[PDB]
Amino acid sequence: GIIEFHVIGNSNRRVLLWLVGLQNVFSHQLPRMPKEYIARLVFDPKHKTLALIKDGRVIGGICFRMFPTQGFTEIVFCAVTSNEQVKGYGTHLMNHLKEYHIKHNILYFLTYADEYAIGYFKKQGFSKDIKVPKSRYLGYIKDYEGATLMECELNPRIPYT
Amino acid sequence: GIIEFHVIGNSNRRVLLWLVGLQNVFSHQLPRMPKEYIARLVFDPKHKTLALIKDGRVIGGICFRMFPTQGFTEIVFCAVTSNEQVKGYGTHLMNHLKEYHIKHNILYFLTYADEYAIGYFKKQGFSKDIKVPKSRYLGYIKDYEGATLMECELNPRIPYT
Amino acid sequence: GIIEFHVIGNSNRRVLLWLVGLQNVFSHQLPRMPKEYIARLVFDPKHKTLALIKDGRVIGGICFRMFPTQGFTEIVFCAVTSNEQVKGYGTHLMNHLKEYHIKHNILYFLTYADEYAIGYFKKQGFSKDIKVPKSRYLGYIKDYEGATLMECELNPRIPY
Amino acid sequence: IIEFHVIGNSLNRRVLLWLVGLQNVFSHQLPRMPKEYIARLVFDPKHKTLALIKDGRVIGGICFRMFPTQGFTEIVFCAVTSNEQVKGYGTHLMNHLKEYHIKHNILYFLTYADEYAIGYFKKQGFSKDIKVPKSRYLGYIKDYEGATLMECELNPRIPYT
Amino acid sequence: GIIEFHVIGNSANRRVLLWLVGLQNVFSHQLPRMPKEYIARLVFDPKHKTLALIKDGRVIGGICFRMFPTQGFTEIVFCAVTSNEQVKGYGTHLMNHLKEYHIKHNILYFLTYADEYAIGYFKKQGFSKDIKVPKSRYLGYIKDYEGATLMECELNPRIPYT
Amino acid sequence: GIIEFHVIGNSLANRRVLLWLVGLQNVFSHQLPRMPKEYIARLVFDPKHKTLALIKDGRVIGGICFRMFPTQGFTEIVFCAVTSNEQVKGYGTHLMNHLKEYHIKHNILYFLTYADEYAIGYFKKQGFSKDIKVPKSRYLGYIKDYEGATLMECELNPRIPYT
Amino acid sequence: GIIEFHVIGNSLANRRVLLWLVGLQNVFSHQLPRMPKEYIARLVFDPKHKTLALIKDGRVIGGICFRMFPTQGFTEIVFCAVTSNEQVKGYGTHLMNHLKEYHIKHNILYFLTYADEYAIGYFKKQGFSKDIKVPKSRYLGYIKDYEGATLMECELNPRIPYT
Amino acid sequence: GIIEFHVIGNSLANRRVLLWLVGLQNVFSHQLPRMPKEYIARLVFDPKHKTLALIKDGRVIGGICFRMFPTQGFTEIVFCAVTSNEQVKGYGTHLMNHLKEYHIKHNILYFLTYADEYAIGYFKKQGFSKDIKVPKSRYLGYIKDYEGATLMECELNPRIPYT
Ligand SMILES: CCC(=O)SCCNC(=O)CCNC(=O)[C@H](O)C(C)(C)COP(=O)(O)OP(=O)(O)OC[C@H]1O[C@@H](n2cnc3c(N)ncnc32)[C@H](O)[C@@H]1OP(=O)(O)O
Ligand SMILES: CCC(=O)SCCNC(=O)CCNC(=O)[C@H](O)C(C)(C)COP(=O)(O)OP(=O)(O)OC[C@H]1O[C@@H](n2cnc3c(N)ncnc32)[C@H](O)[C@@H]1OP(=O)(O)O
Ligand SMILES: CCC(=O)SCCNC(=O)CCNC(=O)[C@H](O)C(C)(C)COP(=O)(O)OP(=O)(O)OC[C@H]1O[C@@H](n2cnc3c(N)ncnc32)[C@H](O)[C@@H]1OP(=O)(O)O
Ligand SMILES: CCC(=O)SCCNC(=O)CCNC(=O)[C@H](O)C(C)(C)COP(=O)(O)OP(=O)(O)OC[C@H]1O[C@@H](n2cnc3c(N)ncnc32)[C@H](O)[C@@H]1OP(=O)(O)O
Ligand SMILES: CCC(=O)SCCNC(=O)CCNC(=O)[C@H](O)C(C)(C)COP(=O)(O)OP(=O)(O)OC[C@H]1O[C@@H](n2cnc3c(N)ncnc32)[C@H](O)[C@@H]1OP(=O)(O)O
Ligand SMILES: CCC(=O)SCCNC(=O)CCNC(=O)[C@H](O)C(C)(C)COP(=O)(O)OP(=O)(O)OC[C@H]1O[C@@H](n2cnc3c(N)ncnc32)[C@H](O)[C@@H]1OP(=O)(O)O
Ligand SMILES: CCC(=O)SCCNC(=O)CCNC(=O)[C@H](O)C(C)(C)COP(=O)(O)OP(=O)(O)OC[C@H]1O[C@@H](n2cnc3c(N)ncnc32)[C@H](O)[C@@H]1OP(=O)(O)O
Ligand SMILES: CCC(=O)SCCNC(=O)CCNC(=O)[C@H](O)C(C)(C)COP(=O)(O)OP(=O)(O)OC[C@H]1O[C@@H](n2cnc3c(N)ncnc32)[C@H](O)[C@@H]1OP(=O)(O)O
């Protein structure tokens, strides 16, 4: 097939239906996220989603929230559909999302990871060492007591894509 | 009777008299809080009140001020009228306010609690450990020095109502 | 005379000529300050000045800069005119400034004081012990090597 | 005939061409930074550039990002064109930048200087001893590669120009 | 270095605003016997203009004047140069620019009050104690001063002053 | 108490002002009986005239009706009256002071008036004199020369406060 | 029959007003045969001129043409005529009285006019004097000085009912 | 050989008028060489000025630049010139007469001008006198002085056709 990347969000019909498809993949791959909570965040206007499309069908995505006053982005949800995982799609999504944030000159990623996702973010260059000060993210990024906070710092000079 | 909840504010005649109704309950149940000060805030545009209506009549409410630039909300007055207390009206009021704040992406409450109501705030999940940075609120919330600063974190995945 | 207190600032002819009177009084009483620096601050939109008027003319005031997101107010200029000093006017000015900030939930004054005025700030409750962390005020207040950083702590009050 | 203009992409052909010209001098004198990255910053509305013009033509400039919410300005690019160096143009540029900043009530400069240029900043008054809290700049100023963080404190009573 | 002349007045942006403060300062300081508030009232009066002498962005002198086109003259209200810039010909240069300005606006008479300590400066600017303009034309329009000498200057519009 | 001062006049439009103007017409007229009431009403309600009202507890207790001649560089004082049971308390002097401050703001620094014999002492205490410096060509025919009245002039000082 | 007085002129229109101005130009010209009809028509239709028309049974039987100079504080009387069959019945005097009442209510108190020899006695009886109180600088070159004519002035009392 | 007269001025003006004012500035410049040509241009193009242009075959051959002061009741004569090859043919007199006729219809009846030895005799033949009836207070600081020049006045009669 042919693969497309598209940053979208609920600020168009294909956008709306692509968003419903993202809420489906997020809900299926993250069974502990209440479905209504996914849809509330995914359809929220100051959230954006990097969609991974295969033949006009939503097969993955990274839902994120830019905090340019506080100088970082929240990674909200990460999913590739089940039969399309372990093929590098996750890595091309993250790399794409990184180059986009270069172009908007935000250079920091914050996210919470459970024990089953920590390996993925580590392999995208995320660390437990948080350089961003608490005074800047607490109360803006959604806390997850029980999961590890991870951070990734981008180089506004190297080609990610 | 017929119980209703409404987040009102002064930014209808029906709403005007509900605000006077809330200023009345707040004043009676907080008798050393100067009435003019209670009126000044309840009729302030940047403050809002969650009225509890029973059979068309105001019997309770929580008056608050959301600081979405700082990520928390300040709780200002809580009261139920004398002959409706100890029936759970307090709890449903707070639960409703939690739900209102989930849907508005503000997940932290801050309040001062006197020696007469800290047991209520404890039972609504408020703690003396403030996880919000002192710098986030020191210039925003009024300091009722003498009373105890208390904090409530909201889980946006749990249903509260 | 008729004594008035007004908190004014550059966004009206009356306010305007009051800011010029204030710049006059700050400049004449602090003559090693550049006239153009005082004027640039007094007419800065995010500074305010508490003007003390006696019979429609400025006789003193306090120019300040509030930092709400930081929990204090910087005190930039304090002057009373020469022929009206030693009369409690400096104390009424600072007192009014305290009430203003107690309404507005700012409970801390920060200021640099020199050897000619440090006693007057002491008498208004300033000390050399700075309880505001350096991380809250550094880079926000104009640091002045050679003068003494001093702090005043206000008691909060419920209106009426 | 020498002129100094603070310019930038607002929200004018002579302005637009000067910005193409600055972007060229920055690209040529800072070979490390990718030309595409220099353009996004020089043409960003939140960034400004102080242009040094010698007979209608750009020979130097300083690209800066003001953070008045934090009390400092980031100095992003410094360059004088090779044919015009060691003629005191860099000092005249930094002086005008200083005057521009005392009129705008910002009194700290923060920059990352590579080992090759630390001597120049040192002679414009910069120090390696950083009086701003780390928590105040981390994530706003682009952390640079291997460069030294430097700070310049301004005194709003000197006429720098 | 970097001398400029600007006719400004209060209609004001903050550059013009801060310059009027500078002028009011220079006037106030060189005219100690004029009340600061009176100088400020007139400098910021809309029907008043000031020719500012700007030296490297900073005010160092000026002439505050008030044009009376229907009366056919202009009132010279305040002249001052900062103490450390006096006796370099700056005062003369201000007056010449003010004469060139009024030639183009077809006002060819200046009226001013000078005290014994200022008569010599206006004399060397071409002013005279012989007042050709009639009293009916200026009395109660220009602000009289007790003890000051009234002085008049007549301009030639066929002569270039700057 | 609650003394107020208001400069009012017919605009060539408000009922509070209109009843105030009638109060002034009455006070002027009762204090100046040998002046036609119609003439006093005509001037008070004339648009290019103005009156400085002295309000005490909402009721008119005095005022000064004047005509500004900005083109001629002076203002004419037309009527001055304080109601009888409020005289000799400084109200006539406070009225003249406020009227002075008002004119300094409009760069009119000369008052002219034709005082009758009963008023000369009041005008003298407010700084008027018989030595008229405004040349006759500037005021003649613009103010009426009532035979037997005394032309009196007051010069205002724009550097000094009057209120 | 029905006598009316109307102050008219050629403004910035009415068919009745316009025929009256012809009637006035006719009366002035016939009663002043030694002034050129063309000149009488220029002034009578000049917009800065006004005529107080005496109307009897809808017909023009006389009038006064004047030029108000409010800036200079006087009015110029330009032409006075009553048609011959209606002279010596007080109409000339009523016109002047009406003209006086009109200027009183407009705050103008001085009339000026250049009378010829045959009109001195009429102006004398209407209160004019050869003794001119307005300074020469106020009227020279605003009113027209004809050689051989007598300047005459009338001073108006605004406290006097003229009509 | 077809001669016209037009009152033109820089109205704050089409192509024809603009090239005529430039002509007039050229002619005034050549015939009055002690006047800076930039001074003639400033006044000739001044909106408060006007010029009576003498046009012969579409070509400017003369004119009179004048400034009307209606509040003052006179007009200043600023420049008079006829081109050299058209002089002493009565052109300068038709110009002054056309200008007199223009001014009576605008109710201005005095002319003031400065003239040195060379020009004085021209103005005398147009009826100017060295005896000024306009008082000094009316024209001083309104008309441009020239020392070395004689102030001259001319009185116009509005019962007279000048052209
Ligand atoms: C944003 C807030 C969050 O934390 S959401 C939590 C993350 N989301 C989920 O875990 C949902 C379930 N997982 C998935 O949908 C996918 O496996 C995700 C995590 C999106 C990765 O997509 P995928 O298409 O497999 O990408 P990929 O082929 O590039 O694999 C990357 C390499 O990393 C390694 N890895 C180690 N641990 C993991 C892990 N838990 N999930 C995925 N990959 C992991 C894999 O070996 C893989 O290959 P390699 O190591 O580069 O050779
Ligand atoms: C924000 C600043 C403030 O306003 S602080 C002051 C709060 N307001 C007052 O004190 C006003 C007077 N009191 C009241 O209006 C009500 O009692 C308040 C405190 C609002 C509670 O409403 P109410 O409907 O009675 O409570 P509820 O039935 O939902 O009971 C919930 C549980 O709380 C417990 N509790 C312990 N201490 C108190 C207390 N001081 N007041 C009320 N309840 C208290 C009750 O026992 C009850 O316990 P449980 O559910 O049986 O486990
Ligand atoms: C914010 C940075 C600054 O502005 S620091 C510079 C302050 N300004 C100056 O030094 C300019 C010249 N001085 C002044 O304008 C006035 O003296 C100032 C300092 C404003 C005080 O106003 P003033 O009304 O005269 O004083 P006050 O009558 O209210 O007296 C209050 C008590 O303070 C005492 N005091 C001790 N040292 C001083 C001093 N240097 N200047 C003035 N007062 C001082 C007075 O004795 C008086 O004592 P007490 O109340 O009798 O116990
Ligand atoms: C983060 C912002 C950045 O751009 S960091 C990298 C700085 N930019 C570069 O290195 C680009 C290439 N160089 C240039 O464009 C110019 O030479 C720069 C560095 C801007 C200086 O301007 P320029 O006109 O040459 O300097 P100037 O004539 O005003 O001389 C001032 C004094 O500085 C001294 N200096 C010491 N080290 C250096 C150095 N590495 N480069 C330039 N000047 C340096 C010079 O000797 C000069 O001498 P002195 O003060 O009389 O002793
Ligand atoms: C109240 C009404 C008003 O208009 S204010 C009255 C005048 N104002 C003042 O005196 C204020 C204080 N004085 C000053 O600010 C300046 O000295 C003034 C008077 C403005 C002159 O400016 P300044 O730059 O010094 O003059 P300049 O360098 O062009 O010198 C020109 C020549 O004038 C002569 N002169 C005679 N008397 C004076 C005098 N009182 N002040 C200054 N110069 C004066 C000087 O000899 C000077 O030199 P020279 O004659 O050309 O060789
Ligand atoms: C041009 C307008 C006119 O028709 S001239 C008419 C002026 N009005 C009248 O004559 C009306 C009758 N009188 C009044 O209405 C009031 O008395 C007037 C004149 C307005 C003064 O008001 P009133 O408030 O009483 O006066 P005041 O208390 O402010 O001042 C009183 C001081 O003035 C002195 N004075 C000397 N002669 C007179 C006088 N003829 N009328 C009033 N005051 C006069 C008194 O000695 C008294 O002296 P002191 O300064 O109070 O100690
Ligand atoms: C220079 C350009 C002008 O417009 S000169 C203005 C005068 N007009 C003329 O001379 C033109 C022809 N005359 C007339 O139309 C009328 O006679 C004029 C002058 C307008 C008078 O109108 P008429 O209706 O007669 O007035 P009137 O009846 O009110 O007479 C009042 C008393 O005035 C007396 N009077 C003394 N001298 C004269 C005189 N020269 N012309 C007219 N009346 C004059 C008469 O005796 C008459 O009677 P009595 O004195 O009350 O008993
Ligand atoms: C600021 C001052 C001003 O308003 S401009 C001052 C005058 N302008 C000039 O002198 C410019 C050069 N001269 C000319 O352009 C013309 O010759 C002027 C003066 C405008 C006359 O026009 P022009 O067409 O030649 O005259 P005209 O034929 O209508 O009449 C000629 C009659 O005038 C007599 N005259 C006596 N003295 C002079 C004189 N100085 N200039 C011209 N004419 C003069 C001639 O003898 C001749 O006499 P007559 O009337 O025919 O019997």
Numbering used by the authors:
A (entry chain H), B (entry chain F): 497 to 507, 513 to 662
C (entry chain E): 497 to 507, 513 to 661
D (entry chain G): 498 to 508, 513 to 662
E (entry chain D): 497 to 507, 512 to 662
F (entry chain B), G (entry chain A), H (entry chain C): 497 to 508, 512 to 662
Paste lines from the article.
KAT2A is the first identified histone acetyltransferase (HAT) and succinyltransferase. Here, we report that KAT2A can selectively utilize acetyl-CoA, propionyl-CoA, butyryl-CoA, and succinyl-CoA to directly deposit 18 histone acylation hallmarks in nucleosome. By analyzing the co-crystal structures of the catalytic domain of KAT2A in complex with acetyl-CoA, propionyl-CoA, butyryl-CoA, malonyl-CoA, succinyl-CoA, and glutaryl-CoA, we conclude that the alternative substrate-binding pocket of KAT2A and the length and electrostatic features of the acyl chain cooperatively determine the selection of the acyl-CoA substrates by KAT2A. Superimposition analyses revealed that all the studied acyl-CoA molecules fit in the same substrate-binding pocket, surrounded by the sheets of β4 and β6 and the helices of α3 and α5, indicating that all the studied acyl-CoA could potentially be utilized by KAT2A to modify histones.
